[PDB]
Amino acid sequence: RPTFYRQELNKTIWEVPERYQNLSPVGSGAYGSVCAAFDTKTGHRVAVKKLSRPFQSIIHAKRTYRELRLLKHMKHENVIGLLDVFTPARSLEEFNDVYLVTHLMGADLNNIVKCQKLTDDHVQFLIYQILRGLKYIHSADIIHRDLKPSNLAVNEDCELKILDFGLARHTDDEMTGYVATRWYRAPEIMLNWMHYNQTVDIWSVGCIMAELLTGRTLFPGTDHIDQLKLILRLVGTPGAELLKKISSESARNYIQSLAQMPKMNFANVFIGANPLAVDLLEKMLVLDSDKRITAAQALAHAYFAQYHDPDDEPVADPYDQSFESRDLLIDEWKSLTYDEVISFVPPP
Ligand SMILES: Nc1ccc(S(=O)(=O)Nc2ccccn2)cc1
Ligand SMILES: [Cl-]
Ligand SMILES: [Cl-]
Ligand SMILES: [Cl-]
Numbered sequence: 245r246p247t248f249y250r251q252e253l254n255k256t257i258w259e260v261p262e263r264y265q266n267l268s269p270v271g272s273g274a275y276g277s278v279c280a281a282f283d284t285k286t287g288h289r290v291a292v293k294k295l296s297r298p299f300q301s302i303i304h305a306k307r308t309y310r311e312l313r314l315l316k317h318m319k320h321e322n323v324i325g326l327l328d329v330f331t332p333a334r335s336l337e338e339f340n341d342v343y344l345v346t347h348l349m350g351a352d353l354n355n356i357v358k359c360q361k362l363t364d365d366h367v368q369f370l371i372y373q374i375l376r377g378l379k380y381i382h383s384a385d386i387i388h389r390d391l392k393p394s395n396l397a398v399n400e401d402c403e404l405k406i407l408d409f410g411l412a413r414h415t416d417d418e419m420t421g422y423v424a425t426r427w428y429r430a431p432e433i434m435l436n437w438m439h440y441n442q443t444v445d446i447w448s449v450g451c452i453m454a455e456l457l458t459g460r461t462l463f464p465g466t467d468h469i470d471q472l473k474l475i476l477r478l479v480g481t482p483g484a485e486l487l488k489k490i491s492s493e494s495a496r497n498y499i500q501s502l503a504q505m506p507k508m509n510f511a512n513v514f515i516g517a518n519p520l521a522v523d524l525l526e527k528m529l530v531l532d533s534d535k536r537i538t539a540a541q542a543l544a545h546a547y548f549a550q551y552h553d554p555d556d557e558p559v560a561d562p563y564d565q566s567f568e569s570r571d572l573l574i575d576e577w578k579s580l581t582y583d584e585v586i587s588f589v590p591p592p
């Protein structure tokens with residue numbers, strides 16, 4: 245067991261191993277508080293996240309377990325991984341606090357799309373890395389559910405990592421109105437049309453790739469219905485085959501109230517783009533999720549010919565998510581989480 249020391253950073257007690265030095269507040273959502281630190285064992289600058297109220301409800305206890313299972317599993321160059329997890333507790337009986345440690349990320353994709361000039365070669369390399377990461381995540385039957393520019397870390401060498409997986413957090417108010425939180429969402433999840441699956445993440449990649457090519461948001465809706473009208477004007481209104489797959493009768497009645505529109509010419513929308521980029525956007529931005537290109541298929545598209553290496557696009561180890569259908573008490577979720585903290589083995 246390492247030696248721990250205590251300090252107060254902005255009205256919060258931090259109790260951490262001596263290896264972590266020079267802690268400074270970086271931010272705080274409703275999920276926890278984050279400090280930057282120097283890790284003397286590895287020589288990396290790190291982010292240390294102290295969870296808030298991890299075991300306050302069954303919902304919160306299961307979310308804590310879900311987050312630690314997911315971060316312990318992810319071992320890929322284009323996905324955030326876990327450097328360390330610790331608790332100052334010496335037994336299950338006094339266990340209350342969970343701390344997660346990752347590499348400190350500088351810039352997100354928003355800090356390069358808004359203020360930097362991008363060549364086609366930059367767009368090829370950035371979208372290639374998102375898809376390489378997604379091939380890995382989807383091979384474990386994990387859905388990210390919240391891909392958007394603020395959830396993609398990028399360095400000076402244009403190297404990219406996916407972070408901030410959807411742990412089923414987002415609220416109704418968070419998705420309301422003129423908000424980036426909704427602009428990258430597939431229409432079937434935005435309006436609860438049907439049981440969604442991993443295809444929702446490829447819709448989000450289409451929206452991100454369009455914005456790297458034009459420097460503008462693709463579907464900046466002022467509300468859910470405004471956003472749907474922007475989407476259907478580009479890709480066309482649904483045919484009979486998709487309408488059959490929408491489970492809400494009321495959602496089917498609403499779609500049938502709209503005037504029919506054909507799919508637009510994407511070469512006239514993405515003026516001057518590489519024809520191969522236009523072709524790949526037509527294959528991602530398909531209304532029927534069954535007919536969208538997959539991550540594995542997209543990596544073999546001619547747009548990525550300069551970067552594609554089928555011997556360096558790995559898949560994940562199998563991931564058991566059977567806990568998701570399990571009904572447990574707060575103290576049972578807390579015991580499972582405690583076991584996952586004490587069994588953690590750091591990377592080389
Ligand atoms: N996409 C993205 C999000 C957050 C940050 S950070 O500068 O807060 N750095 C962090 C935050 C959490 C974990 C690691 N680094 C940088 C990039
Ligand atoms: Cl230590
Ligand atoms: Cl990482
Ligand atoms: Cl504790």
Ligand SMILES: [Cl-]
Pocket residue numbers: 354392393394395424
């Ligand atoms: Cl964003």
Ligand SMILES: [Cl-]
Pocket residue numbers: 562563564565
């Ligand atoms: Cl597993």
Ligand SMILES: [Mg+2]
Pocket residue numbers: 394395408
């Ligand atoms: Mg985020």
